[PDB]
Design a protein around this ligand. Structure first.
Ligand SMILES: CCNc1nc(N)nc2[nH]cc(-c3cccc(C(F)(F)F)c3)c12
Ligand SMILES: [Mg+2]
Ligand SMILES: [Zn+2]
Length: 313
């Protein structure tokens, strides 16, 4: 309980910024997460022995895929940490606990394939969950690990508080289904502009937390250009492997997933920034002003893809 985690000076400082990269040393990522939990929540919120044991099982249950891996989990969790720390007073004690956990667990047991692929393959998970297939699986794996011996990090919550926190985690993980994001953001944009947005309405908080989840999930686009550029390589390696699996089912994949259409990548990045990424950080910034650095970093990267097209790189 008198056992603060501490990081080297460069990490102690840069971990507080939205555009932090956690680095290539896998063995520090557990310590980085615990440091964030302790600074975001308290040294008191979790039992150190139980939390370490949870983190290491969560890591074990992520797979060796190019993008949707353990590094993605910890990266998404760091962006949540930076939102929460810039928005000190806005969030309950349960929310601070639930959200860093949700982010670490949001892609548990990802195989590097989209909901679409699972449905077209006729994967058993598509029979068990007609919508948000993989996200209901990720939540399912999160509960499973919570139920392992010595892994209930929520042990000191009441039956009531426990059920609220698992319900935060559940909604937070479903919201990472990007198909759900577009309507979530429209509704939020309308609520904000007709001035009906009320963070005391649980049903409003839910939508705000879903947007935070999309934002943290998409956060490769809020990094400095060299991180953004090299992360895009991992994203497309997964997309093209799926395209290959689509071609084996006898289905032309969408060009995003077709590795024969590598040339179209920069124009695709533009659409993505324009249709998804910018709207997302803009609406988030309107609701939570201190998140403006994510919007700014995204605008910077849109500008770098526009220079890729004009062949200035
Ligand atoms: C276009 C390039 N995509 C992406 N590019 C980057 N940099 N980050 C990303 N994270 C998720 C996607 C993604 C996943 C599924 C569907 C789509 C959509 F374009 F349909 F919205 C997008 C994505
Ligand atoms: Mg996911
Ligand atoms: Zn994710």
């Amino acid at each position: 309980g008198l056992m603060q985690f501490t990081l080297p000076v460069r990490l102690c400082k840069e971990i507080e910024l939205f555009h932090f990269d956690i680095g290539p040393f896998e063995n520090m990522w557990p310590g980085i997460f615990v440091y964030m939990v302790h600074r975001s929540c308290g040294t008191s919120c979790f039992e150190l022995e139980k939390l370490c044991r949870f983190i290491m099982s969560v890591k074990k249950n992520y797979r060796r895929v190019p993008y949707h891996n353990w590094k993605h989990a910890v990266t998404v969790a760091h962006c949540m940490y930076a939102i929460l720390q810039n928005n000190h007073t806005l969030f309950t004690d349960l929310e601070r606990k639930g959200l860093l956990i949700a982010c670490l667990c949001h892609d548990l047991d990802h195989r590097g394939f989209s909901n679409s692929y699972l449905q077209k393959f006729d994967h058993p998970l598509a029979a068990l969950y007609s919508t948000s297939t993989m996200e209901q699986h990720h939540f399912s794996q999160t509960v499973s690990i919570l139920q392992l011996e010595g892994h209930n990090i929520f042990s000191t919550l009441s039956s009531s508080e426990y059920e609220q926190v698992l319900e935060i985690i559940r909604k937070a993980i479903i919201a990472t289904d990007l198909a759900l994001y577009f309507g979530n953001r429209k509704q939020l944009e309308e609520m904000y502009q007709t001035g009906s947005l009320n963070l005391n309405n649980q049903s409003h908080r839910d939508r705000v937390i879903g947007l935070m989840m999309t934002a943290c999930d998409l956060c490769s686009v809020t990094k400095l250009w060299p991180v953004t550029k090299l992360t895009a390589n991992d994203i497309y390696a997964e997309f093209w492997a799926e395209g290959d699996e689509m071609k084996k089912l006898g289905i032309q994949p969408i060009p995003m997933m077709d590795r024969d259409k590598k040339d179209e990548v920069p124009q695709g990045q533009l659409g993505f920034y324009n249709a998804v990424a910018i709207p997302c950080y803009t609406t988030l910034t309107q609701i939570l002003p201190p998140t403006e650095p994510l919007l700014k970093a995204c605008r910077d990267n849109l500008s770098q893809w526009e220079k890729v097209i004009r062949g200035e790189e």
